[PDB]
């Protein structure tokens, strides 16, 4: 049932932005996300 699978990697979801000469997308809400960065 479980086995090692070899495949060409996927860079991510193909997100075609709904571009137009009239459409803008101004966010109505945010997120105060804390990112952890480690440096020697």
């Amino acid at each position: 049932s479980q086995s090692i699978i070899a495949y060409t990697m996927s860079l991510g979801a193909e997100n075609s932005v709904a571009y137009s000469n009239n459409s803008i997308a101004i966010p109505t809400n945010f997120t105060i996300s804390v990112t952890t960065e480690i440096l020697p």
Binding site: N29, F30, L39
Partner: protein
């Protein structure tokens, strides 16, 4: 709400550091690299390097000094090569660590001691803060960033044609919820009724490609009437 989000984000960092063991990968890798370099340097003493004995006290006892001198020469050549290799590796690693430490000092200066507008320099998003945390042979930054979440489509136009003259937003974006036109800041949907206070007139309506007819409220006109 923002205070709660900040507290919950810090708590989630706490939990993620507690659970995932590969979080401090950079520091662990640096320590392991130095440790294995030291271990290899120590183990290099057990190699013959062409001498018939890998221990120096036996080659001097079993062999006469006139003949043992060439074996000592082989051993010293091998061990000196090992030391030069170790020192070269140490110097390259120290250059890399110095680059990382200069980057850490820059991040401290520009994010702990200020707010950096450099994109993705301190966290993914519009950077807000940074809280240094000490660590074994390193530092950890809790880059507090502002990330927009809930976007909404809107109809926008570069200018606003009122009274036969173009109107541009002083700061913000002209947007419409289908029928009514509003000016909104660029990072948070806060519709504002269109007014001369937040729009500046900049010529006539013919030049602009994308201008839309609308009205611009005049604050002083109602006080003129009353």
């Amino acid at each position: 709400l923002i205070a709660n989000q900040f507290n919950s984000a810090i708590g989630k960092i706490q939990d993620s550091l507690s659970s995932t063991p590969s979080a401090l990968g950079k520091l662990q890798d640096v320590v392991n690299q130095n440790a294995q370099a030291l271990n290899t340097l120590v183990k290099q003493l057990s190699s013959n390097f062409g001498a018939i004995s890998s221990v120096l006290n036996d080659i001097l006892s079993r062999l006469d000094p006139p003949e043992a001198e060439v074996q000592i020469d082989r051993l010293i050549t091998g061990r000196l090569q090992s030391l030069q290799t170790y020192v070269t590796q140490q110097l390259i690693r120290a250059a890399e660590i110095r680059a990382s430490a200069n980057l850490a000092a820059t991040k401290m200066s520009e994010c702990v001691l200020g707010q950096s507008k450099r994109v993705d320099f301190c966290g993914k998003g519009y950077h807000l803060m940074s809280f240094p945390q000490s660590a074994p042979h390193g530092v950890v930054f809790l880059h507090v960033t502002y990330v927009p979440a809930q976007e909404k489509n809107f109809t926008t136009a570069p200018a606003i044609c009122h009274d036969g003259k173009a109107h541009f937003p002083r700061e913000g974006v002209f947007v419409s919820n289908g029928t009514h036109w509003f000016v909104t800041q660029r990072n948070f949907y806060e519709p504002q009724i269109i007014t001369t206070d937040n729009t500046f007139v900049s010529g006539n309506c013919d030049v602009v490609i994308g201008i839309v007819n609308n009205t611009v409220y005049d604050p002083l006109q109602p006080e003129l009437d009353s």
